[PDB]
Design a protein around this ligand. Structure first.
Ligand SMILES: Nc1ncnc2c1ncn2[C@@H]1O[C@H](COP(=O)(O)OP(=O)(O)O)[C@@H](O)[C@H]1O
Ligand SMILES: Nc1ncnc2c1ncn2[C@@H]1O[C@H](COP(=O)(O)OP(=O)(O)O)[C@@H](O)[C@H]1O
Ligand SMILES: [Mg+2]
Ligand SMILES: [Mg+2]
Lengths: 170, 171
């Protein structure tokens, strides 16, 4: 197995292009209420999970929810792309605020995989361009993650590694 | 039927004792995303919709989601007991902030009706004094609702009346 160790209380930040398998993975490994997704929050504020114009409002809600969960000592997983340092920054700050370990889980997959998964989605397929951009942003992000403040940085380099993941707590 | 007319830009506040059929009613009449419930918010912040220790955080979250929705011009229904004036006040204020009409839908049913439904619930049952207290607080609330800032006050007086409700946009 690919064992990924996390404290019983931590902020797990999933990092991956659209189509890399973040939501599927989060559902496999965590309780439904431990996962806050940006899609879900777009739905909460707008009725429409695919409404790209309510991003700011959705993340405000996501951030505030994360804040409450850490305040109360609840393990939390952020299901969003998180490929831009600017998106990760507030999460680290929140985890810092509540003295919680931020943990990076990176879906470092070949663009080609995300593109073909995207091609076969039945919900919201994105433009190829989006995944080209996300993937390159992800690639430029890996090096600096530890310095950004992530206490553990876990990089998954193939679907075979992702599939063999097991989280050990403590 | 019993037609309740609301504008497209409404904050619909359900007001009813535990066991009065608020959540059931909300699911029947509104889109899933239109309904924000205190139970659901308890789950968001605690993993547990029945967790009574997290009230402050849950209602903080509910109020924030409400404000974001009304700011975006999205109809919203608050699914919480709402029998205390102090509960209703922050909701009214948020609605006014974004030029939204606060609408009260009141489940003015006999205590016995809720007590009986309560004993049959599978999700979580409350002690009898809870429903007795809610019903008395509700009955004491009715007269003053319009004055509190609700633009339309709809009082439903029996399970028959509740069952016959149809919402019409005003719009
Ligand atoms: N391990 C996997 N192998 C093959 N297909 C997958 C895998 N994980 C997810 N998918 C599929 O790829 C698409 C993207 O998955 P999803 O979890 O929605 O990714 P994301 O949340 O990162 O956009 C979905 O159609 C999903 O069913
Ligand atoms: N019209 C009705 N007749 C009989 N039982 C009902 C009716 N509406 C709701 N119930 C039941 O009563 C219980 C309380 O309903 P619910 O909508 O959860 O109330 P609340 O949300 O106000 O606590 C549930 O078990 C529900 O199935
Ligand atoms: Mg997803
Ligand atoms: Mg309910």
């Amino acid at each position: 197995s690919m064992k990924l160790t996390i404290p019983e209380l931590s902020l797990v930040v999933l990092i991956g292009s659209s189509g890399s398998g973040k939501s599927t993975f989060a559902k496999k490994h965590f309780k439904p209420t431990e996962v806050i997704s940006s899609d879900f929050c777009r739905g909460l504020v707008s009725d429409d999970e695919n409404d790209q114009t309510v991003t700011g409002a959705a993340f405000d809600v996501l951030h505030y929810i994360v804040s409450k969960r850490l305040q109360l000592g609840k393990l939390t997983v952020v299901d969003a792309t998180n490929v831009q340092e600017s998106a990760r920054k507030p999460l680290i700050e929140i985890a810092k605020d509540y003295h919680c370990f931020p943990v990076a889980v990176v879906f470092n997959l070949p663009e080609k995989v995300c593109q073909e998964r995207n091609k076969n989605r039945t919900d919201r397929q994105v433009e190829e361009y989006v995944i080209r951009k996300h993937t390159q942003q992800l690639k430029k992000s890996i090096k600096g993650l530890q310095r950004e403040g992530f206490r553990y940085v876990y990089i998954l380099n193939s679907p075979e590694e992702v599939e063999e993941v097991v989280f050990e707590r403590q």
